[PDB]
Design a protein around this ligand. Structure first.
Ligand code: FMN
Ligand code: YMH
Ligand code: ORO
Length: 366
């Protein structure tokens, strides 16, 4: 309800965030979500929100982005809050602790977060066993239109980046509906340089060879997640490699190392990736560019600063088939998920679209 949204947004979450620093709050949220405990959200998804892409049906196009459930501990609880799909990770091959604390910062006056977690990860083996313990349950959820994505990273000290990603394909590929090759974290030395043309072609050739070697019912789609901070040359190169190799999709975008003019939060000059509202339109414009460079033929998951139905529809009209959110959940709590879906349905009807599918890329056809 708007009453439930208001209680969370004006009383419960402001109070808890005043008592808990963001990393402690994040850990408590994941732990609590994993317990189930809470009933499924009220909103009932209508037919016009269904999307068929990446070889799967999505009951609604609003997902939880990577980095909230880094280790696969709260998947079922996230479906209960109404997300149409869940992405876990990033997961590294070996366990690692990430950067020293403090490493997460809130910018309440900007509705933004800065983080430098550094790929803290339980590692592939632990996550593999966690997902195996619910693998058949996930198979039924996927069949019912609730797919699962797994986001892969690399270890800090690894010498061969491509072998780190290949290991992730072999270990978690068989448990995923789609895999994400995350070459865009700002918080690992040298990672984003994997976005260049030659490095990217060789890396993605190896990743796709590994994927194709899996048995057919265990063969996921493969997407690449890119930064919002790329040059025009970088974007044309990514688009060329994606089409050359047959990559299945793109996730647009990760956090930004830029600091837009106008930020007010005291913590705006901390090192790390910036998320939330100051990222929104930079991400939407990157979606627009990548859709055009790929001729509308490559599915895009749009992410960055989504907290309303209007935010979601703007990314869909720019070229996204699905959207994700994270930072808005940390400020407004679970009710934001139903709010986005309710507003999106109303806007689709007001703008004369028969459903989400009809609106994908519509800005490009004006
Ligand atoms: C605290 C935090 C941790 C994140 N960790 C990851 C990660 O491990 N892997 C990844 O691909 N993206 C990660 N992200 C990026 C989000 O998936 C998303 O791309 C970005 O935050 C923009 O969406 P938002 O504005 O709705 O938060 C993280 C973001 C935040 C805020
Ligand atoms: C959904 C949610 C999230 C959060 N908090 C965070 O996840 C959080 C934060 O506050 N800052 N932050 C910065 C970077 C990354 C994450 C975060 C909290 C805190 C305030 C306790 C409560 C939540 O309510 C729930 C959870 C589970 N079941 C029902 C209701
Ligand atoms: O530090 C991380 O783990 C991290 C942060 C972020 O914003 N994006 C990402 O891919 N990783």
């Amino acid at each position: 309800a708007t009453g439930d949204e208001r209680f969370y947004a004006e009383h419960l979450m402001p109070t808890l965030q005043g008592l808990l620093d963001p990393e402690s709050a994040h850990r408590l949220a994941v732990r609590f979500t994993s317990l189930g405990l809470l009933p499924r959200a009220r909103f009932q998804d209508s037919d016009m929100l269904e999307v068929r892409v990446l070889g799967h049906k999505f009951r609604n196009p609003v997902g939880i982005a990577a980095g909230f459930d880094k280790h696969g501990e709260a998947v079922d609880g996230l479906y209960k809050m109404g997300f149409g799909f869940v992405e876990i990770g990033s997961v590294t091959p070996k366990p690692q602790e990430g950067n020293p604390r403090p490493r997460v910062f809130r910018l309440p006056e900007d509705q933004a977060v800065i983080n430098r977690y550094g790929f803290n990860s339980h590692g592939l083996s632990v996550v593999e066993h966690r997902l195996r313990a619910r693998q058949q349950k996930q198979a039924k959820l996927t069949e019912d239109g609730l797919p699962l994505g797994v986001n892969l990273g690399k270890n800090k000290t690894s010498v061969d980046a491509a072998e780190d990603y290949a290991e992730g394909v072999r270990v978690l590929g068989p448990l995923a509906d789609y895999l994400v090759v995350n070459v865009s974290s700002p918080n690992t030395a040298g990672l984003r340089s994997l976005q260049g043309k030659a490095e990217l072609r060789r890396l993605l050739t190896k990743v796709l060879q590994e994927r194709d070697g899996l048995r057919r019912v265990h063969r996921p789609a493969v997407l690449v997640k890119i930064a919002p901070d790329l040059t025009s040359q970088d974007k044309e190169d990514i688009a060329s490699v994606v089409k050359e190799l047959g990559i299945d999709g793109l996730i647009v975008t990760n956090t930004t190392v830029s600091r837009p003019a106008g930020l007010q939060g005291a913590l705006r000059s901390e090192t790390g990736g910036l998320s939330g509202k100051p990222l929104r339109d930079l991400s939407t414009q990157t979606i627009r560019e990548m859709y055009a460079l790929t001729q509308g033929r490559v599915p895009i998951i749009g992410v960055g600063g989504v907290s309303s139905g209007q935010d979601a529809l703007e990314k869909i009209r720019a070229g996204a088939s699905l959207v994700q959110l994270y930072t808005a959940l940390t400020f407004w709590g679970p009710p934001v998920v139903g709010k986005v879906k309710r507003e999106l349905e109303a806007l689709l009807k007001e703008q004369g679209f028969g459903g989400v599918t009809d609106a994908i890329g519509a800005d490009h056809r004006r």
